[PDB]
Structure 1
Amino acid sequence: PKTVAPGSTPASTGGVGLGAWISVGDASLRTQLANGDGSLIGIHPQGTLNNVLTVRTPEQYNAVGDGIADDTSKLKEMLSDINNVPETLPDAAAVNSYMEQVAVKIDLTKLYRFTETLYIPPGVSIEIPTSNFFTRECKQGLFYDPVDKNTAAISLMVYRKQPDGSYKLNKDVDYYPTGLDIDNGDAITCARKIDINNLNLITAPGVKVGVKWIGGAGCTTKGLSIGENTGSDITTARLPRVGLLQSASWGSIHENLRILYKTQGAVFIDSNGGAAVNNAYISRLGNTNGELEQAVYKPAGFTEVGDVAVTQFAGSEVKFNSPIIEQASFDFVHAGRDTDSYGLFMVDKPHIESSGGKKKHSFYLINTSSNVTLSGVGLSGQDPDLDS
């Protein structure tokens, strides 16, 4: 005989399974199925449903996915269930271990409004069926809509050494680690095994930075698409002031990156050895008042006023293969490393265009060398004296 004390549960009196409690009847089947993992369902050629379910979705966490409801905690919970990285860690060994966990794929098929910077832990693949392209109304992806606009929508994890030898996750928008920081332990990257396929990210007007790709060595992107072609007034367009900011990401590859921006498209700083940006399509949403934008992250030698599609400095040498740059005051601003002019400006066959022939310079090169191959496409601006 089996004695069951008052206040018992099947789980607390032997569990449910062979030799213990066995579910019987329809009510129990309903709950067994509803609270299971799919193991009750057989599949072909053999095995059970759970054996083949590996993707995660915000819907599993009840995200509304309409770009209205605040789905922040749902997205964070989804991320946490994959790899929950505490914001404070004791030492190097502790932060490094979070890059040695199981990686999981996430599929974003609706529109998720969020109001706090999302930090992607290592071991994450994010996918969306297709990439946005001058999309007027974003329907699938992330919509960053915070109270504090002096922030980034998305950011990789980089831990900063504290006075007591402990490490705290960086949450400062303007911060980016240097190759030196990574060498001397002042910063420790917690960004690895991250893959993006078609992530669409829109932003409330005025948000400072779209994506902070910091410390992402070996991390990859394909079809990453930033910004919304909301309307003619860029001042209300749902796109960030700065599309992407990248540092300490050697060996990182961005395939067919798409960026709709207001102030700066993409910025690459310090160590990014061997990193490539292929077939990028970077455009200011029209060039109205473009010449009045003020670059936010720029080398000291660049003091000119005007929007910049691509900015690079502090020894960064990203390879730009066949980029398409549109509607920019400055297509490229590049500075060699202050100390020795290190960092070759490499642009192969750029497709440069701007409505009404409005432009300041295509290649603004400071204390540097370069190898550029022209493809019979380009222009110089309307000022007969200053534009070149």
Structure 2
Amino acid sequence: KGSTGILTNKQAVARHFGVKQSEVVYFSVGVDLGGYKVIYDKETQRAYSLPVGIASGTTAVSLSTAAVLVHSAGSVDLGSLAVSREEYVTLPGSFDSGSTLNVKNELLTYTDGKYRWDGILPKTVAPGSTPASTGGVGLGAWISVGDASLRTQLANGDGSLIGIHPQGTLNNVLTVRTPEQYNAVGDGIADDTSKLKEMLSDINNVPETLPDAAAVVAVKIDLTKLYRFTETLYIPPGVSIEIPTSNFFTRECKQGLFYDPVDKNTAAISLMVYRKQPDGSYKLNKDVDYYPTGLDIDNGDAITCARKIDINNLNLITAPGVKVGVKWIGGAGCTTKGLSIGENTGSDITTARLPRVGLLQSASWGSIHENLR
């Protein structure tokens, strides 16, 4: 029978919220709300904790499908109160299936966690939706809720969820890039070339070809492991590279760059110089022997794309037979401190991991190298 069904339902509601059976009230127009802790809506079949402070004698007036309760002493958004108490309902379905949200404490599941809607209700979500394609995430929009969401937010964020002292958030003070951010192996065995290149490209993505001369933010890179690479690395303008200390006739490099190309008639590291083409366009120099002359830089046959470059303590190792270690070409005003080129591998220079020519420099007026090794 019915009254029995009502008592057993109150019991089920009470167990869910951890209150007593007597503390659950059904909404009906005119019901006294005093003393109760949880209200049940027969129509929607949803339950809500009631705000404390409802006086005995205060009677219910209306309860909307958005869970706004109006009574004789005032009004309360039960959905909003539920959010503050972390009392939610996870709707059937998903962003994939689509849904309609009516209450502030309803969550819709997405592949990376749950979200509630903080905008105008009701909110219709078409099948095949994502939070980003249906209002984005933020105040007045989709708000991520729960531990699964927090995990994915943290994992995929920039640190803006993490406060730091004296104020601000973690993202405000992260100013170092690293090959490990790109999953470089750093064992001097795996080929970390594409990783290093992506790192440099993310800082300054100068194309290998430029339409005209007119076409032709600085960031600090920390190298802390040993990265093997197999193609010449072109250092773009605006790069500062750093290692904790410099080597000094070190026997086994365990920190820095190891150039190990198939074609040994190449440079390990080069600054960027663009050379004029017969059509008036410019191409990045990739010739190992090429160097710009002061005249070239004048008549525009060459355009320097090497300003604002600084190197601290870079260690560069080279397979035996590699032609050039570093091509410091067009590096006007660029600076170096503790650049070390070549490994003290052993007594046989024929098998030593050092280049035939250490450093080749042209068109670098005002350039300073300190403690070059």
> TM bucket by the smaller chain?
0.5 to 0.7
Tell me which residue corresponds to 1:103: 218
Tell me which residue corresponds to 2:154: 33
The two structures, once aligned, show a CA RMSD in angstroms of 0.4
1:211 aligns with 2:326: yes
1:139 aligns with 2:254: yes
Tell me which residue corresponds to 2:190: 69
Of 73, 85, 94, the residue aligned with 2:215 is 94
Cα drift, residue 26 of structure 1 = 0.2
Aligned counterparts of 1:220 and 1:76: Cα–Cα separation in 2 = 21
Aligned counterparts of 1:239 and 1:13: Cα–Cα separation in 2 = 57
Q: Which amino acid aligns with 2:139?
A: L
Tell me which residue corresponds to 1:179: 294
Tell me which residue corresponds to 2:269: 154
Tell me which residue corresponds to 1:13: 134
Tell me which residue corresponds to 1:236: 351
Cα drift, residue 115 of structure 1 = 0.2
Tell me which residue corresponds to 1:202: 317
Post-superposition Cα deviations, 1:29-50, rounded to whole Å, max 9, x if no partner, equal 0000000000000000100000
Aligned counterparts of 2:213 and 2:357: Cα–Cα separation in 1 = 31
Post-superposition Cα deviations, 1:134-193, rounded to whole Å, max 9, x if no partner, equal 100001110000000000000000000000000000000000000000000000000000
Aligned counterparts of 1:41 and 1:214: Cα–Cα separation in 2 = 43
Query: What is the DSSP-based 3-state SS (H/G/I as helix, E as strand, rest coil) of the residue aligned with 1:94?
Result: coil
Aligned counterparts of 1:45 and 1:186: Cα–Cα separation in 2 = 52
Query: What is the DSSP-based 3-state SS (H/G/I as helix, E as strand, rest coil) of the residue aligned with 1:254?
Result: strand
Query: What is the DSSP-based 3-state SS (H/G/I as helix, E as strand, rest coil) of the residue aligned with 2:123?
Result: coil
Q: Which amino acid aligns with 2:256?
A: G
Cα drift, residue 18 of structure 1 = 1.1
Tell me which residue corresponds to 1:2: 123
Cα drift, residue 255 of structure 1 = 0.5
Post-superposition Cα deviations, 1:76-116, rounded to whole Å, max 9, x if no partner, equal 00000000010000111100xxxxxx000000000000000
Q: Which amino acid aligns with 1:160?
A: R
Aligned counterparts of 1:88 and 1:37: Cα–Cα separation in 2 = 32
Aligned counterparts of 1:235 and 1:227: Cα–Cα separation in 2 = 13
Query: Unpaired runs of 5+ in structure 2?
Result: 1-121
Query: Unpaired runs of 5+ in structure 1?
Result: 96-101, 259-388
Cα drift, residue 128 of structure 1 = 0.1
Aligned counterparts of 1:203 and 1:14: Cα–Cα separation in 2 = 53
Q: Which amino acid aligns with 1:241?
A: R
Q: Which amino acid aligns with 1:174?
A: D
Cα drift, residue 58 of structure 1 = 0.1
Cα drift, residue 203 of structure 1 = 0.3
Cα drift, residue 226 of structure 1 = 0.4
Aligned counterparts of 1:239 and 1:142: Cα–Cα separation in 2 = 12
Post-superposition Cα deviations, 1:352-379, rounded to whole Å, max 9, x if no partner, equal xxxxxxxxxxxxxxxxxxxxxxxxxxxx
- Structure 1: which 4+ aligned runs deviate by more than 6 Å? none
Aligned counterparts of 2:208 and 2:255: Cα–Cα separation in 1 = 29
Aligned counterparts of 2:345 and 2:293: Cα–Cα separation in 1 = 35
Aligned counterparts of 2:127 and 2:175: Cα–Cα separation in 1 = 40
Aligned residues: 252
Work out which of the two has the higher radius of gyration on C-alpha atoms and give 1 or 2: 2
Q: What does 1:51-70 correspond to in 2, within 5 Å?
A: 51-70=172-191
Cα drift, residue 242 of structure 1 = 0.3
Q: Which amino acid aligns with 2:198?
A: E
Q: Which amino acid aligns with 1:19?
A: G
Cα drift, residue 28 of structure 1 = 0.3
Alignment TM-score, normalising by the size of structure 2? 0.67
Query: What is the DSSP-based 3-state SS (H/G/I as helix, E as strand, rest coil) of the residue aligned with 1:206?
Result: coil
Post-superposition Cα deviations, 1:252-310, rounded to whole Å, max 9, x if no partner, equal 0000100xxxxxxxxxxxxxxxxxxxxxxxxxxxxxxxxxxxxxxxxxxxxxxxxxxxx
Query: What is the DSSP-based 3-state SS (H/G/I as helix, E as strand, rest coil) of the residue aligned with 1:130?
Result: coil
Query: What is the DSSP-based 3-state SS (H/G/I as helix, E as strand, rest coil) of the residue aligned with 1:160?
Result: strand
Q: Which amino acid aligns with 1:38?
A: G
Query: What is the DSSP-based 3-state SS (H/G/I as helix, E as strand, rest coil) of the residue aligned with 1:93?
Result: coil
Alignment TM-score, normalising by the size of structure 1? 0.65
Aligned counterparts of 1:236 and 1:2: Cα–Cα separation in 2 = 71
Query: What is the DSSP-based 3-state SS (H/G/I as helix, E as strand, rest coil) of the residue aligned with 1:92?
Result: coil
Q: Which amino acid aligns with 1:53?
A: L
Aligned counterparts of 1:18 and 1:136: Cα–Cα separation in 2 = 58
Tell me which residue corresponds to 1:193: 308
